[PDB]
């Protein structure tokens, strides 16, 4: 796992994308590269002991939909260091960095069944007061909750599920 190696590259890509007003294009460029990193044949090439320069060129070729600034430079710098397998994480960090500057939070909600869209809009407006961000809810229908909802806002979590209260009671005894 290489969160720690991806942090510098994600920060550099993002801090460059705001100097050139193209965060939105960079995100999809990195998403394309992150997908090419997963192919079964390309993953065989990335493991072999090719020279960084020719291995970078063998990676540029499969992605022509890239800027001069973005692919032909970032991919080469990551190849010199042998970091290309880190691309799937350089993407996520990038997304995260963006959500920080844009003052956004990807709050996740979990429930036994769909919410009434009055409950859900109240949740949105209430979390935006709990936090200091524009929230973007996405729901999940997990049956083991049975009733109530779990609200996860990163590392913070609020558990209102009947199963959580049941198994808390089981330890009150």
């Amino acid at each position: 796992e290489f969160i720690t190696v991806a942090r510098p590259y994600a920060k550099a890509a993002f801090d460059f994308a705001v100097e050139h007003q193209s965060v939105e294009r960079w995100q999809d460029m990195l998403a394309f590269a992150a997908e090419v990193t997963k192919n079964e044949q390309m993953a065989e090439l990335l493991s072999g002991a090719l020279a960084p320069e020719t291995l970078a060129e063998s990676f540029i070729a499969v992605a022509g939909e890239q800027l001069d600034e973005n692919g032909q430079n970032l991919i080469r710098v990551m190849a010199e260091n042998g970091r290309l397998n880190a691309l799937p994480d350089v993407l996520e960090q990038f997304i995260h960095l963006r959500a920080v500057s844009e003052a956004t939070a990807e709050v996740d909600v979990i429930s036994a069944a769909a919410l009434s869209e009055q409950q859900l809009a109240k949740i949105s407006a209430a979390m935006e007061k709990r936090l200091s961000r524009k929230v973007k809810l996405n729901a999940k229908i997990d049956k083991s909750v049975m009733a109530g909802v779990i609200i996860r806002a990163g590392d913070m979590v609020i558990d209102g599920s009947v199963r959580g209260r049941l198994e808390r009671l089981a330890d009150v005894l």
């Binding site: 796992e1 720690t4 190696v5 510098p8 550099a12 460059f16 430079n73 710098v77």
Partner: protein, 510 residues
């Protein structure tokens, strides 16, 4: 998974245009700073051993040219530096200022003057790192280098071009013997250099004013890297002193260089090597600690006149130059079976071992026979001194061991009552006072009237006054040859007769 000194904004600069080599290869930026070691990014033009110039007026030495960064050490206070400082590469391999105008100055390890007397009148610059003359360029050392000490000029002779280790425990007269050997060259055409490594500044100032008192300072260069200073300065100081002496060596002149402590250059190099994460060996010293001293001491050499001609482009035709080294080593608790002491014993030619027991007993200088040797031997001596003092060090090698074994009584008194009174009076007359150097004539007459009897029966133990009267009688009246036996070094029967005559003539008045 670890980072390798690639960071967000440098990656951003590469993002702007991959071929940043379109920028100058002449400069870079500091990237990290730790315990005097520095990491630099850029400097595509840097070459190993190069001086890199930092903001302010400071230099670093490029030790590592790695895949993307240069590792260097800072020659001075490093805490003032910070990330991102622009740094420029001077295209010069480390070079110190050198010349005969340095005589009488006290200078930093970089040839920056440390006395208050202004800039240097140096001749040029010369590389701190060099390879000594080859095997075909040397010449056999057969000229005497005179120290003031009756003990070493007799038992442990030194010769221009030789390398004498002075090894002993702390506070046993090592620096005394070294600066007295320097003082004795005051009027013998042979230049001096004293490089102090890791010494505390009070001592260095005291020895500097002591050299000035006796008039020797006008003849010597002093290079100083005190105990407070960065490890890189302490580790590179003796190479600067060697580069300063090698100038006189290569001009067909004579120089004598004294490294005041190689056992602390070794410690500074160990610090530098362990901060660079290199695997250590025995006693935690690096693997190449031997190659630290050898390529230094191997530069003290005597070169034939063809090499001086080829070097000076013909200008000095037919003179032979030499550089004589006397490194000092401090050994813990008197044992020489240790890594660095044995490493240096394996490089220098001779070995003057000063013993703490003798030193406490009042025998000074405490030159221990049997352990001390001169691998050049009698070839270095004036033939008078060579003949008078034939084999006495090996005589004392057994006198000591036998006086140690036969402790209960003087049994088997065949001649042991003569042997171990001769060997006692010889020790008692080798005793000497510092700053009192005895010319070869005074040493030669004294040795003759000890070594073939004439004083093996008279255990008078009033020897200091007897000799102080002898050397005064022979100076005032009895001998003008004191300026002839000290001009030639000759050993005739015709002069032996005159020596016997003056001997008995003085004897008959004590």
């Amino acid at each position: 998974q670890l980072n390798s000194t690639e960071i967000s904004e440098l990656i951003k600069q590469r993002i702007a245009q991959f071929n940043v080599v379109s920028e100058a290869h002449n400069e870079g930026t500091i990237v990290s700073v730790s315990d005097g070691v520095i990491r630099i990014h850029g400097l595509a033009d840097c070459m190993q051993g190069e001086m890199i110039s930092l903001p302010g007026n400071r230099y670093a030495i490029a030790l590592n040219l790695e895949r993307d960064s240069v590792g260097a050490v800072v020659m001075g206070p490093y805490a003032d530096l910070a990330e991102g400082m622009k740094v420029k590469c001077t295209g010069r391999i480390l070079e110190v200022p050198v010349g005969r105008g340095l005589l009488g100055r006290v200078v930093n390890t970089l040839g920056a003057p440390i006395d208050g007397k202004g800039p240097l009148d140096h001749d040029g610059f010369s590389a701190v790192e060099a390879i000594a003359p080859g095997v075909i360029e040397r010449q056999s050392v057969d000229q005497p280098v005179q120290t003031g000490y009756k003990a070493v000029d007799s038992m442990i002779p030194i010769g221009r071009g030789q390398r004498e280790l002075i090894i002993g425990d702390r506070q046993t007269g090592k620096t005394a013997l070294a600066i007295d050997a320097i003082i004795n060259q005051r009027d013998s055409g042979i230049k001096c250099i004293y490089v102090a490594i890791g010494q505390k500044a009070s001592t260095i100032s005291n020895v500097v004013r002591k050299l000035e008192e006796h008039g020797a300072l006008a003849n010597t260069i002093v290079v100083v890297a005190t105990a407070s200073e960065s490890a890189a300065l302490q580790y590179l100081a003796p190479y600067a002193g060697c580069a300063m002496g090698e100038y006189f060596r290569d001009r067909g002149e004579d120089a004598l260089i004294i490294y005041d402590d190689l056992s602390k250059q070794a410690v500074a190099y160990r610090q530098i090597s362990l901060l660079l994460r290199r695997p250590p060996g025995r006693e935690a010293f690096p693997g190449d600690v031997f190659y630290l001293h050898s390529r230094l001491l191997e530069r003290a050499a005597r070169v034939n006149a063809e090499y001086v001609e080829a070097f000076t482009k013909g200008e000095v035709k037919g003179k032979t130059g030499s550089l004589t080294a006397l490194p000092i080593i401090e050994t813990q608790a008197g044992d020489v079976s240790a890594f660095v002491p044995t490493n240096v014993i394996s490089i220098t030619d001779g070995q003057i071992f000063l013993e703490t027991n003798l030193f406490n007993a009042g025998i000074r200088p405490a030159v221990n026979p049997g352990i001390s040797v001169s691998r050049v031997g009698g070839a270095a001596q004036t033939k008078i001194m060579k003949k008078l003092s034939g084999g006495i060090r090996t005589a004392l090698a057994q006198y000591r061991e036998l006086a140690a074994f036969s402790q209960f009584a003087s049994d088997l008194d065949d001649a042991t009552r003569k042997q171990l009174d001769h060997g006692q009076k010889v020790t008692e007359l080798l005793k000497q006072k510092q700053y009192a150097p005895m010319s070869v004539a005074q040493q030669s007459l004294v040795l003759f009237a000890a070594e073939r009897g004439y004083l093996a029966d008279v255990e008078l133990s009033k020897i200091g006054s007897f000799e102080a009267a002898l050397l005064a009688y022979v100076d005032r009246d009895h001998a003008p040859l004191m300026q002839e036996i000290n001009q030639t070094g000759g050993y005739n029967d015709e002069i032996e007769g005159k020596l016997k005559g003056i001997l008995d003539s003085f004897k008959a008045t004590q």
